[model samples]
Target chain A: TRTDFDLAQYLQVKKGVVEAALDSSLAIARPEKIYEAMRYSLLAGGKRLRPILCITACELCGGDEALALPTACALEMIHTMSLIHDDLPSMDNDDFRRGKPTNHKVYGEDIAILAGDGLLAYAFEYVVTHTPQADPQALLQVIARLGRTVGAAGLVGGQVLDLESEGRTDITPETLTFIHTHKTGALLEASVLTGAILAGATGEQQQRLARYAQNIGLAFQVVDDILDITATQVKAQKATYPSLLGLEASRAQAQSLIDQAIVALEPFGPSAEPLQAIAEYIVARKYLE
Target chain B: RTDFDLAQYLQVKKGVVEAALDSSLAIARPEKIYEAMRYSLLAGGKRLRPILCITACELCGGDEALALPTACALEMIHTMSLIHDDLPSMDNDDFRRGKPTNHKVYGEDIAILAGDGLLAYAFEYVVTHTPQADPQALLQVIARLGRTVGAAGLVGGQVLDLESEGRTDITPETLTFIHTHKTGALLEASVLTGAILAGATGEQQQRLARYAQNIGLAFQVVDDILDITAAQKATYPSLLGLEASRAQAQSLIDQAIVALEPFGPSAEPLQAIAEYIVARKYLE
Candidate 1:
């Protein structure tokens, strides 16, 4: 029932959405020091994939395009919180995220910590404050999503597990799976699901979309493993996924997960076009790299 | 109504109430490092006159006992904020409420920082989660209080004044007014008000109570005025003095405390105690 023209227009519009996020994150605040640090993290640039996925899901479900933008901003905020914290003295203590100096490396530890806390708090504030036309309950739903993602069950839980498990070889695969799925995967699921839910997608559609997210999220990590061992360009900063899980098995697993993600979205009764394209985009987008 | 004979019982009860706040701030959480700074800032003593005044609601026939804990808690938090603000890293340099400044005795960087932990979050938690009370109005009141107390009212103004201090040859009275009344008076007002609005008092009683509250506050301000003049033993109005100052203070404290005397001597300590602070230092 869908036309090929819609797919082209959706992709074009999404590129613009990604551009807005890049610019917004770089704007100055009164405090020059913090404004500079936030800009450095934000402008370093990723694919802006999380926000795109959120918008894509919302569009696929026949929702207003503008309604999803604030949440798209929310997704970016959540991602920024993790990256800032990962750079902190207490956590991964990384000096860099993407390519530039991490928040702490640039702003010092205390400001970095406060900046992360500020971003996390403001993300909810942004969504609730910006999404005026949406249902009030939708705002509550976003808050609940944030609490689970960043709070104990998701990002925070994964952080605790990762810290506790560092340098230990005795961890079970199940525990490793728990860390990746909840830690990185929770926000991914929240992003797409938030869009879908806000658009009033059918419960069945959400289940299917969630299934799609779960598989792709795993494949995304799988690709990460491949990148760690094989990529030479950023090898020094490579996450070394294969070091955690061997290469051959990781490769096989990555492709299989992508296949699963495709299978999950198979029954969306034809509004699933953008999702299908996104599943394909996830794989194809990387081929150039 | 409180029993007429309960005045004897009031002193011991206030001591117990003060001790409870002391213990709450100390024992609440000590192990976590980030929160440790907050604990050091919030820990024990400085029942914060705000909490005391809010608790005084009962004195004016408004349930002072119900409001006391919160009143004390708010003041302690305000004190913590000031202590942090005065830290070397933030506002820098020491001495506070006659103690060795929170950070001077503790450490400046951490001390300058932790005031917010107690002020913002603790304030929110108290109003939102206070047991068996008006949750809705509590939230509004806290939001109002937080905006006023945070960067907007206290913090932002402090930042501006800090930037402006000492460079210009400002008058001592003007500087003293800002520190004592601008910063300190807010906590004083917060503790005493809101209850006045909620109480069942008649319009006449309300107007009288408002005057009393202002006088009580002015009395404390006058005490600060005297501290500089008296050096050690000086109390309020030494500069202004006896009849005029008493006429000024007594007129307010009497009307305020009298409104609560209807609640009897048991309810009297709230205003009576504050009234005593002005006069006691003088007698000493």
Candidate 2:
């Protein structure tokens, strides 16, 4: 049954919905440069995976997709903000992302930084002000989670650890896990859990979804590590999974994690089809030509 | 009634705010960035914004504890703005409050992240720790806070200021707009947050907002007059001259006091606060 699920079509529709909402979420406000810098990367196309996962999780749990759209937008805004800041010369110094010059490269570092700040602040505002019909308490919880996801406990903390680890010879696997979990895993987990929370899922259900998200979160990072090696065929200086566990073991671990993620959704039967398909699609990326 | 000891009130509220701010961000994991955030945040200032919040709540007959979390939040947001403004990409200042800026002590990367961490945590701290406020009012505070810090508020004002730099042709109107959004918006939010959180009546909130706007402008005007050495851009003193600027600041303080007229004796402290704004630097 999962094999018949049209994951591509599902993603296409969710992407369209999210793109429209994101476009309208922020207008070309005054002081055009900051707004333009924000819109440049935010509107730049991506998988929209976080928002899609959020919407799908909500729909799977007897919630309307509309109720989760604003939060979905928030997740993407936070993601975009992180990318803009991460690509700064002080940070990664990346020249391009997704084939276009990075935000700093295009907007200059000053406006780029402000644009990230603007998007980060606007994410919370958009959700608080625009989220309709959801319980206010649920919305507050979402805001808190979003903040923690981006703050010291999450992305910032992770980046600090990563930067400190740079060029260090004695990095442990545990330290690497902590870094990836905080930097990338936190927001991904938050995206899934926020959707479930918004749908008023039972406590046990949220617990299961958390496990699912965590597993897939690790799996996603593992796949990224594998790709990094596969594309460049060079381990480079970064301590990636393939560097520690070898490429074969990393691929196996990703597959095993995907299996566990799918099993977590077995309780919901066909209702969890999208999630199950997503778990499979995540791992399928590695096998793609 | 007019001699209700404004100094005593300031002293008390400052003590409370400083203590709360000191304990707010614990030295935890990722110790360096946390330390950077705490260093700048705990750097002594007047704590005027937080005090204004608690005072406004008290004036509206609300409990001080009800406004404490938000009071702390206002300070955090203010500290975040200062850190970002001091960044090399922005103002490039090295000293703040007689001590090194966050970027000066920590590298630019940590400084940037520290500002972001503080700003993000402020929202979380307000939403998670605020126990006494009405839910609706709390949500309103969050919304207003988001607007205050984002492009429409501090960031917008900073952008305009950056654009206005070294240009002598800037008008008084444009300068006022910049100050209103950059400095005045947060001040307005500070007072109104206290009022709204305490469930003040609509009329009460309006008066508090108007009062905040007046003093916010007055504070900036006085600050400009005191720092006449650096006039890279148009300031109240540079644009209007020292004599006219002082007069303008005094007029704003007078208007600020007038807004408190309907609150009667309860407004004495606020009136004193407005007067103290102009009088404090002189006393120093």
Candidate 3:
């Protein structure tokens, strides 16, 4: 019986939250002349969908908004750390990110890498120091979540697969899914689940929230794939789902999984209405195309 | 019969005293790169120099080692700061306290620089942190001290002010005293009265302690005399007498009066301490 959630309102809120986070990170990492190159790339600004997911999930689970913001900021810190290493010459050799030069490109490889190291360590300090006094356990859970999300079982491992899978002719769909979920989805799952955990969502809600995250995570990638072949979308990665899967199948896959993601969030009823709208928006952005 | 204060003994208790502190410093700086630097720097050296300061304060009716460690560890930090700075690139030689230079054995870059990591954390952990235990305020004071000691205050001022030393007519005796007092006296004062006030009513206590510092201040000049007479000698004032020293002391007062000529610019803190020092021995 609740009114329909306005996607525009949520988008504006999400934009403010992420922009604030970006500004803070920029200020903290900016002045280190030795580390400035890496800092510049980090502040280039992207969709910030993962942290927004964290903020949204926390709201859905009834967590205090103010209490959860720092942890959500922490998620972006951890994610930026991943991107820093991912762009290293030995890793992806990426020259650009978020439509700007990669960290190493501007800062030189050594400093670019060290700037990442600095941010990663500082992120822990920020969260532990800033988390509200009442939310210690939840904050501790978030710390644990961060470690798992960026560690060997998560983004790092995903990096290994992504690098190895690149330019490989025999790479299968399953292998690609493994790469996306672990590499990218690990952090995204962490983002969504962290919010839910902070919100004190029920154990069942926690599991469902994770599944919803996982499904949309794959849908997010499939949409990336659709954009890659179509060439009309600006945010798609250099190689995407269409590069691996055909164009029509990639689009259908994205739309289908978007359905699956909505289904996963259905149990939360009206609270999940925002989530369902988010899933639709993910695939249906029309993306300036 | 004289009795020992267990609290006082525990103040210098190597094992029990620095457990929380040593453990925290160890854990926080667990990197292998800094392992040897930490090992040599902290290895069971005498914490007595810091202890004397607290004793001095307590004898003057001020009982607080908490306020004293700032002075105590300050000497240690100063000693260690010197050791780390005197490495191959900065000082370009090695040998300290009858042991290998911190950098000599550890290798130059780590030795010359690892002290930075230690110094930053030292003030953070030992003095400001131990006294206040408020991390925010502790960090502010620690930062202020770091800027003072690192390049801005002691070190920077040392290089700038020393050019006046030993110059016959150009470098007045008073200027020499001012230079040394700023660099050396601040360290001595910081060590002598490191224990913080922490809202305690200790004005009389502070004056008495400052009186002791002023009287015993000759100990540093005597050490300078010995250094001049020793090998590895730096320049000495080359003049020694109670009369000359007293005249030099008057010059410090003249500078103080001149500094206060502009009247109250929130200069009360310096004014109080200066007044206390000039009349310090009278309280005794």
Candidate 4:
């Protein structure tokens, strides 16, 4: 009963669709510099995991793919904006992201800041104005969730706390959990939840989807921490799971989390095959590397 | 008709806006960003946009309380523009309204986040809290807010203003474009959003839009005149002679008052506010 789901093919089609949607989201409007800066980072290739996750969640819950596409694109826009700001000289001061110069390095700091601002504003606008097919109340909820995901309650809060805790040996597990959960978990959770909400998923389905997201979210972060510690090509300077919990324990925790994520999808039966494959594929990357 | 009590009305509404603003945002775990946001947000500007929104809503037969959230949102967006405008990369000023600018106290990084936070939260506040208004009207307000902040509105005007700096060949039309967008866009949005939320008819919307543009330009001209003798950017006084600038501002005020002729006595305060803007310029 378990043989024929092609996860790679699924992701390939979804990525192309998301890429096209993202490209059309903004035009080369006036004030070309800000627009250029925004497009430069936005179009830069990534795995498009957030959008893929959003689409998968929407499909699993019986939602129209077209209805969820704008929000999926909006997720990537918000994610890209965060990267632009995170790379500023005053923040991480990194010169490279995704194997290329960061936004500020390509555009000046001022334009980089403006570009991020423009993208953030555009994300909300894109969803509110473009998602004419979605349930009005659901669309409003998506808007509220996106805002909370970026504001003090989410990414910004996580980053600021992470900044404040740098080079300190006193960071507890609770602190690390808070940082990772908000910084990374919040958006991922919103991604899955929004897709489900748009599909008008039952409360039970939402609860399961949220648990799935939470488990994989933590698993992904754990893998990142491990990769930074083990890989020579990568670099990071803050507290991490491997540093705090030891490599073996970190691996065990990631595997356990992945297991939990798969367990949540069991209730959906075979329709959740893509999600199940994704959950395993995430942790599987560590072994391959 | 009798002269209206403009001072009492403004004071009362400003108080309403201030309380709504303070209660809506909270200082939580990552207190620094929240503090930075509140620092700039609660710094107590004129609350002109909020008052304008509430007044427009009331004039259109909507409850003032129903419009307060949108009013607060307008103020937050206004505060965001000011924060970014005062950044070192922008106008590079350290003092505003006799207090240190946001970046001057919080580092540049926090200041940027504060502005971003405020802007992002503004859209959320309106979408989440504005259930009392017509849903379609609320959606229209959100769309307008998005335009007001994007490259088409405030950002567009700013980009143009930045490009036009130190140029001797600037035309009056270009100058008007810059002021209308940079300063006037949000002002226009404030009034239109209130009117729209109250389900204003197309004709009423048109009049309010024209009225807002008039007061907005008049306010800009007076500001330019007041800022003239000691400033250097492209301004009305610098483009038009001082005497002509004052005349142009008064004409706009007169035009604004005329636009309100269809609205009856309920528009008296709005009329008084427009007159007060020009009156302040003369008084100084």
Q: What is the TM-score of each candidate against the true structure?
A: 0.57, 0.96, 0.50, 0.94
Task: Provide the lDDT at A77 for model 1.
Answer: 63
Which candidate tops lDDT?
Answer: 2
Give the worst 10-residue stretch by lDDT in candidate 1 chain A: A232-241
| DockQ of each two-chain model | 0.09, 0.76, 0.03, 0.65
lDDT of 3 by residue, A1-289 (tens): 4585679777887868777765664442212353354356556677677778888898888876676676677677667767876776655679988777887787655445444544454454455555545254455456557655654456655665576566766777877888898778888888889888777778899888888888888987787666656676444234557766778788788778888888888888887888789888867775554
**Model 1 misplaced stretches (Cα beyond 4 Å):** A1-12, A21-29, A202-204, A231-245, B1-284
Query: What's the fnat for candidate 4, on a 0 to 1 scale?
Result: 0.54
Per-model i-RMS: 7.1, 0.9, 11.2, 1.4
Which residue segments of model 3 deviate by more than 4 Å? A1-5, A25-31, A34-38, A232-249, A286-289, B1-284
| Candidate 2 residue-wise lDDT, A49-120, digit = tens | 999989988988888889999999999998998899889988888999999999988878888888888888
lDDT score for residue A155 of model 2: 83
Candidate number with the higher DockQ (1 or 2): 2
True contacts kept of each: 0.00, 0.64, 0.00, 0.54
> Which digits, one per residue and each the tens of the lDDT, describe model 3 over residues B1-284?
38644434534544433453355344221243245445555655434334444443343334454544444345445544555446442344556656776656755434423443333344334433353333332332333343334322344333333334345543334444543433543443442343232322345434433433443343344344444445122222455444555554555444543443343433333333434434533332
- lDDT string for model 4 (B178-281, tens) is 88888788888988998998888989988888888999888888887887665246777877789999899889999999998899988888888888757766
Residues B70-159, model 1: lDDT tens digits: 565455446555664564434555555455666555444334334433443334334323443344334333433533453333443344
The per-model lDDT (C-alpha) reads: 0.56, 0.86, 0.55, 0.85
Backbone clashes, each candidate: 7, 0, 9, 0
A157-253 in candidate 1: lDDT tens per residue? 4555565556665666566677788677877888888888778878888888888888888787778657756775332232344665678877888
- Say which prediction, candidate 3 or candidate 4, comes out ahead on DockQ: 4
